[PDB]
Enzyme design. Structure first.
Site, PDB file in Angstrom:
ATOM      1  CG  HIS A 248      -2.043   1.014   1.089  1.00 19.56           C
ATOM      2  ND1 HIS A 248      -1.914   2.326   1.492  1.00 19.56           N
ATOM      3  CD2 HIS A 248      -3.272   0.910   0.533  1.00 19.56           C
ATOM      4  CE1 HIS A 248      -3.034   2.975   1.235  1.00 19.56           C
ATOM      5  NE2 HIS A 248      -3.879   2.135   0.660  1.00 19.56           N
TER       6      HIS A 248
ATOM      7  CD  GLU B 133      -2.419   2.570  -2.952  1.00 19.03           C
ATOM      8  OE1 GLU B 133      -2.780   3.369  -2.053  1.00 19.03           O
ATOM      9  OE2 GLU B 133      -1.506   1.742  -2.774  1.00 19.03           O
TER      10      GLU B 133
END
Lengths: 243, 246
Positions: free
Chosen positions: A92, A162
């Protein structure tokens, strides 16, 4: 193949707030042809597994690079398996860029978690400074290669793009541009079957009021939702947008 | 003024193995007037809280530097408070030396967890090479300074001295060596914080403590208890360590 919507609760929630979120998720009408996953903080995964509808599968937000042992503070993939997680979020943006996780490190987690039978939500994406250097694809490709070089199989893997560089607003065209390039990279560097079977989900800022135009894009297979996943109605609307 | 014995389970355990460990801990008789604490992995903290005797308080093994938010994978100190933890381990050698946590980063966690009403187990300790260079005290003092500069209160703070060459190696520090460092830590607190903090603060020894070697370490004037690694995964062994400090 099914679309995929994951809710990353991040470092948020208490026993009380999670009762209310589970209550609202349980009462939501969710279309049946979407794979729905939520990722609670470690402390609360057992409470969620116990009282959330089993229509929704459970993810953790991180794990260690290898088996358990003398790693104070860390959670091992076999422990994720034991507690009932079917997925773990790896790489992430917050772990890469706030917390310094590098590609080799993330690659070790992916190899080890898959070896324990846990699915991977494999996160990639470039910073503003990298997009500006016209290195969007160099960076995303280098990140994908680190997953690819480590994984024994892609069967239980979903890729989350992302757009870290936005934090302006990414357009659906800018998102689709990357998802297409990601799927092309899989086609050329892994296989045609992996390129078509792998869900590629959009992990930029998404809520019930901007998901519908992203959902229409050809290579956007769903979403990795941030803050909107902390509210039942918003999250359910995102799930139902890809059904 | 109570001794303090903590069990750091580290990254070990499953529901099944933890049932067995909890059963063994519940079945031991623990001497009164010792603060006893166990630190399960985050996943299992509720199961422990629910079924382990409430004689024993619960610690976590880490937390984030500040309040919750967009910190995927991290656990905040207010979540630790919510779930029932009364302590968090900070600055453990494995997080310093395997995972790169530095003094200032650790100090931020200490200040923030304290602000949430969670007790601190503040770990310090020197590497083999540093002791070889006669820098044991230099290093330990610098690590204490970083905690002291960050902490807005020393209430519910315990200092754990972990000679890094003794963690998991089976080379326990001799009682003489441990006592020498514990005395120095307490003198440092007396000189740089206050004599009240120096006399009140528990300074516990970590590093290969087991049921055999705990008795002679516990005799030392400035060793107020233990932070126990591998032996805390065995109920009877951990209970004998708790009982040694009486």
């Amino acid at each position: 193949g099914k679309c995929f919507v994951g809710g990353n609760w991040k470092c948020n929630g208490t026993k009380e707030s999670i009762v209310r979120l589970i209550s609202d998720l349980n009462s939501s009408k969710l279309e049946p042809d979407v794979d729905v996953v939520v990722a609670p903080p470690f402390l609360y995964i057992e409470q969620v597994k116990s009282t959330l509808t089993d229509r929704i599968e459970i993810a953790a937000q991180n794990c260690w690079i290898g088996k358990g042992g003398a790693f104070t503070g860390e959670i091992s993939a076999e422990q994720l398996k034991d507690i009932g997680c079917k997925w773990v979020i790896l790489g992430h943006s917050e772990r890469r860029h706030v917390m310094g996780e590098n590609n080799e490190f993330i690659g070790k987690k992916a190899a080890y978690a898959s070896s324990q039978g846990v699915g991977i939500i494999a996160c990639i994406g470039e910073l503003l400074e990298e997009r500006e250097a016209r290195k969007t694809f160099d960076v995303c490709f280098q990140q994908l290669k680190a997953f690819a070089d480590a994984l024994p199989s892609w069967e239980n893997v979903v890729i989350a793009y992302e757009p870290v560089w936005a934090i302006k607003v990414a357009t659906p065209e800018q998102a689709q541009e990357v998802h297409a390039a990601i799927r092309d990279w899989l086609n050329k560097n892994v296989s045609s079957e992996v390129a078509s079977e792998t869900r590629i989900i959009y992990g930029g800022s998404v809520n019930g009021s901007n998901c519908s135009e992203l959902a229409k894009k050809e290579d956007i297979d769903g979403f990795l939702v941030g803050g909107a996943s902390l509210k039942g109605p918003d999250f359910a609307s995102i799930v139902n947008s890809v059904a």
